[PDB]
Amino acid sequence: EDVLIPFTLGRMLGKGEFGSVREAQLVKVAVKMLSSDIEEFLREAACMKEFDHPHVAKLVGVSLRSIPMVILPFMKHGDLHAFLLASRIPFNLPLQTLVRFMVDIACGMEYLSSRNFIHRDLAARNCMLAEDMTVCVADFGLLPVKWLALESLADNLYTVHSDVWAFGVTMWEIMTRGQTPYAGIENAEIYNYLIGGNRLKQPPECMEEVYDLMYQCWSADPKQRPSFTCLRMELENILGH
Ligand SMILES: O=C(c1cc2cc(F)ccc2[nH]1)N1C[C@]2(CCN([C@@H]3CCCNC3)C2)c2ccccc21
């Protein structure tokens, strides 16, 4: 398949548990550094290559070094979490801009779920800012306890409904401008917090109707959480008002 790529590596862009990222010249790109495991990587790489949507990060391709590598378009504006943080610690964005980020993410997630694709790691840090400042869902997954639904934590179940829960957490991050969810509560106590009936609190300035929507995303019953289509409609209406 025209997905595999035989470029040269450049400056280090960042690193983490997932591995490291560096720029490369193919066109400037971002390159993600990571038997059986290397097998399905390639398998799922092929399905991700056919994503084609304005609010989903394109896959340029994949490659092999001697570690699996993911080749991505270089997005200079970086990720949404870093941007929200950079507003706070200082630019100011109207409510309109914050709700528009949510609409953008809801469109890309609507598209992914329409293709039966479960992200599993939706969070502000995994949303990228494009040149025109639109947001694109990224990092599809070729532990993040604070974004995980009850049934993901308890039963390891990942569905569109658990993607929707993490979308709700992402809405909260947007409204708090990049604050760590459940700050001062440890990962090991998150489940206990949640089956308690406790949720992330309404941010001080947050429009009630925006909080009502994100709150819906954290229903204990996965079937009670709105769809991405319903999220996008409600967010677009809010944006129009
Ligand atoms: O274009 C860049 C990029 C990196 C980068 C680094 C910079 F310092 C400045 C601009 C940048 N642009 N990247 C970075 C990632 C790969 C790893 N991801 C991190 C993983 C860890 C969690 N956050 C997300 C985001 C990405 C996905 C899709 C399309 C492009 C890009």
Q: Which CATH class is domain 1-74?
A: alpha beta
Closest C-alpha among 153, 185, 184, 183 to residue 166: 153
CATH 1.10.510.10 fits 75-240, yes or no: yes
Those residues with Cβ within 8 angstroms of residue 21's Cβ, 6 or more apart along the chain or in another chain: 12, 13, 14, 15, 30, 31, 32, 33
How far is 174 from 131, CA to CA, in rounded Å? 19
User: How many CB atoms lie under 10 A from the CB of residue 63?
Assistant: 18
| Helical H segments across 27-186, by residue range | 36-48, 80-88, 95-114, 150-155, 160-175
How far is 123 from 135, CA to CA, in rounded Å? 12
Residue pointed to by tokens 């991700």? 48
Specify the pairing of strand 68-73 against strand 61-64. Answer: antiparallel
How far is 119 from 169, CA to CA, in rounded Å? 14
Of 75, 76, 119, 136, the residue with max ligand 1 atoms within 8 A of its CB, to mutate for a pocket test, comes to 75
Measure 33 CA to ligand 1 centroid, in angstroms: 12
Of 53, 62, 128, 136, the residue with max ligand 1 atoms within 8 A of its CB, to mutate for a pocket test, comes to 128
Indicate whether residue 78 lines ligand 1 (CB < 6 A): yes
Dihedral sign for Cα atoms in the order 207, 213, 218, 220: positive
Report which DSSP code applies to 227: P
Closest C-alpha among 161, 113, 159, 156 to residue 137: 113
How far is 120 from 161, CA to CA, in rounded Å? 10
- Please identify which of the residues 79, 104, 121, 163 carries the catalytic annotation: 121
Please indicate whether residue 132 is annotated as part of the active site.
no
Q: What is the domain partition of the chain in residue ranges?
A: 1-74, 75-240
How far is 4 from 46, CA to CA, in rounded Å? 9
Atom 23 of ligand 1 has which residue's CA nearest to it? Answer: 125
